[PDB]
Amino acid sequence: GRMHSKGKGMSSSAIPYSRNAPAWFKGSSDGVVEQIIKYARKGLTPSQIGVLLRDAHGVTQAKVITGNKILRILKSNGLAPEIPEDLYFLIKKAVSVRKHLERNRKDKDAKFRLILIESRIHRLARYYRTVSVLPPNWKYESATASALVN
Amino acid sequence: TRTSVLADALNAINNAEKTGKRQVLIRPSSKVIIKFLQVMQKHGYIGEFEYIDDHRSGKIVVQLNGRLNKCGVISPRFNVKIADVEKWTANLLPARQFGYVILTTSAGIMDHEEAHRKHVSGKILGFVY
Amino acid sequence: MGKGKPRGLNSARKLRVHRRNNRWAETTYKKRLLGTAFKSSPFGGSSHAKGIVLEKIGIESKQPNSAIRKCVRVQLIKNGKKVTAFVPNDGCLNFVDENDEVLLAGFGRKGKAKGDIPGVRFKVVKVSGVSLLALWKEKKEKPRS
RNA sequence: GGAUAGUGGCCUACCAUGGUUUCAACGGGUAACGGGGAAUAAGGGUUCGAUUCCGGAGAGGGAGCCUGAGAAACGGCUACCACAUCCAAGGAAGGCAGCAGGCGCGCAAAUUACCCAAUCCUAAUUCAGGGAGGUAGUGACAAUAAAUAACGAUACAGGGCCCAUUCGGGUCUUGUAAUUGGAAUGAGUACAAUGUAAAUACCUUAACGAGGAACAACUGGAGGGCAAGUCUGGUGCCAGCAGCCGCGGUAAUUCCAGCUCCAGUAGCGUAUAUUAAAGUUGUUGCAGUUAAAAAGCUCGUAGUUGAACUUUGGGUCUGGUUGUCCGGUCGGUUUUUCAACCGGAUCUUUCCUUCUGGCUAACCUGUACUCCUUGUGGGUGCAGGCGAACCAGGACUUUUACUUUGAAAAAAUUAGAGUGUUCAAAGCAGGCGAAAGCUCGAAUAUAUUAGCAUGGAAUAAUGGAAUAGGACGUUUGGUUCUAUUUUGUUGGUUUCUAGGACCAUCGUAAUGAUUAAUAGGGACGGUCGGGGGCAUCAGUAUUCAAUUGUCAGAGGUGAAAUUCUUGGAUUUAUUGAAGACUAACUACUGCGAAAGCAUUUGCCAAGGACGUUUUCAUUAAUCAAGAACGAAAGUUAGGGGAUCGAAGAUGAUCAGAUACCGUCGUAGUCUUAACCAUAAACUAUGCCGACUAGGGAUCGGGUGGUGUUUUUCUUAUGACCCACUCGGCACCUUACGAGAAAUCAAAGUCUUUGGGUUCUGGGGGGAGUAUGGUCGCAAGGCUGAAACUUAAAGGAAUUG
RNA sequence: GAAUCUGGUCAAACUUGGUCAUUUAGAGGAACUAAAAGUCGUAACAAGGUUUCCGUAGGUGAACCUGCGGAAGGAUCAUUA
Ligand SMILES: [Mg+2]
Ligand SMILES: [Mg+2]
Ligand SMILES: [Mg+2]
Ligand SMILES: [Mg+2]
Ligand SMILES: [Mg+2]
Ligand SMILES: [Mg+2]
Ligand SMILES: [Mg+2]
Ligand SMILES: [Mg+2]
Ligand SMILES: [Mg+2]
Ligand SMILES: [Mg+2]
Ligand SMILES: [Mg+2]
Ligand SMILES: [Mg+2]
Ligand SMILES: [Mg+2]
Ligand SMILES: [Mg+2]
Ligand SMILES: [Mg+2]
Ligand SMILES: [Mg+2]
Ligand SMILES: [Mg+2]
Ligand SMILES: [Mg+2]
Ligand SMILES: [Mg+2]
Ligand SMILES: [Mg+2]
Ligand SMILES: [Mg+2]
Ligand SMILES: [Mg+2]
Ligand SMILES: [Mg+2]
Ligand SMILES: [Mg+2]
Ligand SMILES: [Mg+2]
Ligand SMILES: [Mg+2]
Ligand SMILES: [Mg+2]
Ligand SMILES: [Mg+2]
Ligand SMILES: [Mg+2]
Ligand SMILES: [Mg+2]
Ligand SMILES: [Mg+2]
Ligand SMILES: [Mg+2]
Ligand SMILES: [Mg+2]
Ligand SMILES: [Mg+2]
Ligand SMILES: [Mg+2]
Ligand SMILES: [Mg+2]
Ligand SMILES: [Mg+2]
Ligand SMILES: [Mg+2]
Ligand SMILES: [Mg+2]
Ligand SMILES: [Mg+2]
């Protein structure tokens, strides 16, 4: 029922019956794979990619048409970034609150949230470290996190 | 989180059977559920049941018979040492006479009478009476 | 509801530490674990206590009833503590007399006041080696003075 | 290295900086020796274990050691302390926590008895010894077994009744009488002999031994709890009983005495523990809206818990195991007509770990083909060769939990089989002959914690191929080997080769990722908000002051007063400053983790829901430690101070009133920089999770309506109607569900007790105190006692 | 092969301090509890005669009062346009 707030939504994508393709929506596995790896070199993330693939072009899922997911495509071509997609988007937000707090000493409910986002990261990092994506004995935080971003 | 699906399922059953619904829906739907239900079918606490494949997780439709009274679940799956079955079934079911204690084991998911014939115990799941 | 307490197959410790540390609000268990009996409770956590009649008191009782109760302040031998013992039966503090060795008993209530005698937790039994009931009923006689 | 019998930080040198810890290290406590066990006794348990067995310690303490196989012995020694003996003062001797005894302590516990005959033990040992051990004494520790009359007759009453014109015999059976009478009995003594080491006592008896006076049952109780006195005398709120309730002021059923009577009975009471009762400690199994009890809120590490998914199904035979079908039989037994049930072998896209070899049992065989009913009934029989019929060695095992039967868990205990100790409690005895010799026994079970054994593969975890450095092998090269066996035997060097190991390259295979949880995160989209920070705008308000104007009061009043100016205060109007607030809308509305948040725009980041054929793929829920915020008040330190306004003054009232009201009015209020960290921070309802019932609404999202109206002609937005939907906030009725009820659709799905997790409570007080932490500038917080005290404190409802 | 004796070593105990724990006199203080029942009021319970409460400051002769904020366990589930 959400991680942090007390709001219990099911804002959700459904996923249709067919693991198989919706045949008529054409293209190819390789053509879509080449389509993807352009966007992986343009800097766009799996989540952005798959929106672009879906919205304009005829893809439903890369999972469907290619067999591989997307990150799994990108990894196979060496275009997945060091710091994972999701974590990176939190590490960005962290910085964008740590920055806002440095200016605003007196601002409590942002300090509150910053303590959330920080914690959310250490949930995800601690996940990723145990997967063996990020190397362990490596903490993803605040001072050096600004450098990890840029 | 949704923890013991089996329980969370059997709870819906127990609510359904209480009101006298002729059927129930059960979201998550496992092996254990189905081998648990299968057991209820072999004794006759349960009618047909129809395992939907969401191209996904599970989902079941049970047909209740008006025969279930309680579709018990005991919660931390206690290991049972063969003689200790008698103490579980004594403390869970009404009477030496009739009832079943659905226990997973080496043999699969038996009831406590079948598990005595076989001479093979294990963990408990639930019961029916 | 989950019903408060944990239920894991590996909980145990969070049961067994919880039940150590709730028990402590069970007044039976607290006296046993903290030796109130020994460290306090005039008698040394003991059935009885011989103690010298320091004076024959009359104790005016609590309300509803009204009677002066005819007791004895004692000096418990072993501990050197002073207590107040009741003397059962018609007179019979007459039979107790003064500066006698008096064997005491708990009144019944595991400490505490027996009924209306406010601040008396003990019954005399043996006065200088007899038994008050044996005197009172006069089946036995006192060993002279 | 040293030592030790020996391993070792056991000791020493030199070196390194480890080791344990919230899965409670360390410390403290223990009225703690451990275990076997004990009591309790549905199940789960609790408490106890000094104490008959097994370990361990100790011999007043603490040391040190001799001898010795074995001693850090103490019925050995050395010493020092502590205690004490014997003295001719120079010096000697000591150690009961062996037995007996005594003191002392204490509520609390035995005789300085007789013995080695048993049981065993020791030695130079048949022969000696043994307070080890037995034998008594004492012994209401426990426990076992059971006398305290029985049968008559006569004499007075109850019950059946042959019949009941009134009786009554009483033919038949029961109870009462200091009648009376016959018949036993060990309680005792005592020759004897048993018994016994000798005795006692027991079992056995020569001889005596019962008549109500003897050869005598007490304890407690007699209103309720709780079995049973409204008997007789006293007593008279006393004296007393009374676990609790409570009784007692002249008929007290509770005190105290007689007779009745009850309960238990050679026992029963009392006290303290303790177990049960106590589901009042709760794992099973409690409570927390209000009764005690949900941390103010969120985060959060450990913990604990954690969606679903991978081998299912069908056949084919083949072993049992009881009901059946008759007893086919001399109340028992062997098959079939049949059964369910439990296996086993397999075959099904299927390996059960695989080989280097031993044994290949067997025929898949067919080498001569026939001992022979016309035959595929039957076997002397050995080159290719089915290996499961076993070994005996590799190779290397994903590992656990879980469960199985097994091996082990000393005996006594515990349950329990066998058995005439007279019965038992027990004990390991016993049983049957010619009664010349023979002969059954002395079980079985438990104890589940850990380890070991083997099966099982559900459950749960864990693991493997996604840089494949992956898997195999007719690879073909290689690279590093290792290395024994023959070349006569040693030292080589290189082979052939067979085993490692390691990069290549050629092939083989279906080459290798499960979902994508109405889990979660994260991306995107449009939105939404009185969410927060920082910045501005207003209203308009109150205040003072200004200038302005107008000449008696204006304020206040709670009913009523005081109190203020007039040299127009007030009132009227224009402003100014300051620092406040930020109405009306404003709601069973919104947002916020809470606390809390409404004038404005702007900026700053954040956020929920929503939608989503987006992406990761277990990241998740709750959480002791730790944190973040956290109303008001308070506090330092600043700014301001309009009004109210803790303090104060002060005016009335009342028996009085430093209390309301009255009037004024520092501190504050407000703000800024610090702290504080609590509130009825209250929905007095922890969080997550699912599922149960309708009604209609209610709102923030979203669908569909040739719907209506807007009207700028079709409109298209907007705004409704109506139906259904995800999200939010609350009501109505029945409750068949809950609940003590009030009530509650959650406080339901709970004695038909188990989804996950955190926390809190265990009569009331004493007390949120004492103390100690710890935190604070302090106030205070957090943490948190008992002694003592008390029978009720509550809660909810009913009638008054 | 004795007494004797030079280093070690084990280390009682004493000496004179230091330190934890448990006990235990203690003048005094300051409590808290029982109460026969006395003074002073009469706070709360009825809108308890200023509605109760809570938090928190100040003050008092005592209950108590008064700010501020909060809560109804309130003396109200109610004013529509
Ligand atoms: Mg949800
Ligand atoms: Mg969370
Ligand atoms: Mg009185
Ligand atoms: Mg060495
Ligand atoms: Mg001890
Ligand atoms: Mg013990
Ligand atoms: Mg012992
Ligand atoms: Mg002792
Ligand atoms: Mg011993
Ligand atoms: Mg001694
Ligand atoms: Mg010694
Ligand atoms: Mg000895
Ligand atoms: Mg000795
Ligand atoms: Mg002795
Ligand atoms: Mg005794
Ligand atoms: Mg002895
Ligand atoms: Mg005797
Ligand atoms: Mg006799
Ligand atoms: Mg009597
Ligand atoms: Mg009487
Ligand atoms: Mg009665
Ligand atoms: Mg009596
Ligand atoms: Mg108990
Ligand atoms: Mg309770
Ligand atoms: Mg409460
Ligand atoms: Mg699972
Ligand atoms: Mg027995
Ligand atoms: Mg003014
Ligand atoms: Mg609004
Ligand atoms: Mg406004
Ligand atoms: Mg905490
Ligand atoms: Mg404030
Ligand atoms: Mg005042
Ligand atoms: Mg609090
Ligand atoms: Mg609370
Ligand atoms: Mg208490
Ligand atoms: Mg020396
Ligand atoms: Mg009023
Ligand atoms: Mg009053
Ligand atoms: Mg009042």
Residue whose entry in the numeric block shows the structure tokens 């104790």 = C59
* C-alpha closest to that of A142 among A83, A99, A111: A99
> β-strand B126-128 against B71-73: which pairing, if any?
antiparallel
CATH of the domain at B112: 3.30.1490.10
- Tell me the two tokens of residue A116: 């959330």
Contacts (Cβ under 8 Å, ≥6 apart) of B69: B17, B128, B129
The C-alpha atoms of residue A82 and residue A73 are separated, in whole angstroms, by 15
Residues B35 and B53 in one domain: yes
Q: Is B75 helix (H, G, I), strand (E, B) or coil?
A: coil
- Tell me the two tokens of residue A124: 């995800």
Side-chain-side CA neighbours of residue C79 (13 Å): 20
Looking at beta carbons, which residues of chain B come within 8 Å of A16? 55
* Experimental determination technique: cryo-EM
The C-alpha atoms of residue A84 and residue A80 are separated, in whole angstroms, by 8
Q: Do B75 and C11 touch (CB under 8 A)?
A: no
Question: Are B58 and B67 spatial neighbours (Cβ–Cβ below 8 Å)?
Answer: no
Residues B46 and B91 in one domain: no
Residues B80 and B122 in one domain: yes
Residues B102 and B87 in one domain: yes
Site from A3, A8, A17 to mutate, B interface, most B CB atoms within 10 angstroms: A17
Site from B8, B11, B75 to mutate, C interface, most C CB atoms within 10 angstroms: B75
- Tell me the two tokens of residue C55: 């004076």
The C-alpha atoms of residue C124 and residue B102 are separated, in whole angstroms, by 64
Question: Are A17 and A134 spatial neighbours (Cβ–Cβ below 8 Å)?
Answer: no
Domain encompassing residue B125: 69-129
Architecture of domain A81-150: Orthogonal Bundle (1.10)
User: Of B35, B68, B101, which residue sits at a domain end?
Assistant: B68
The C-alpha atoms of residue C7 and residue A135 are separated, in whole angstroms, by 36
CATH of the domain at B26: 3.30.1370.30
* C-alpha closest to that of C49 among C144, C131, C122: C122
Residues B129 and B76 in one domain: yes
Residues B50 and B83 in one domain: no
Per the structure, how many domains does chain B have?
A: 2
Question: Are C123 and C86 spatial neighbours (Cβ–Cβ below 8 Å)?
Answer: yes
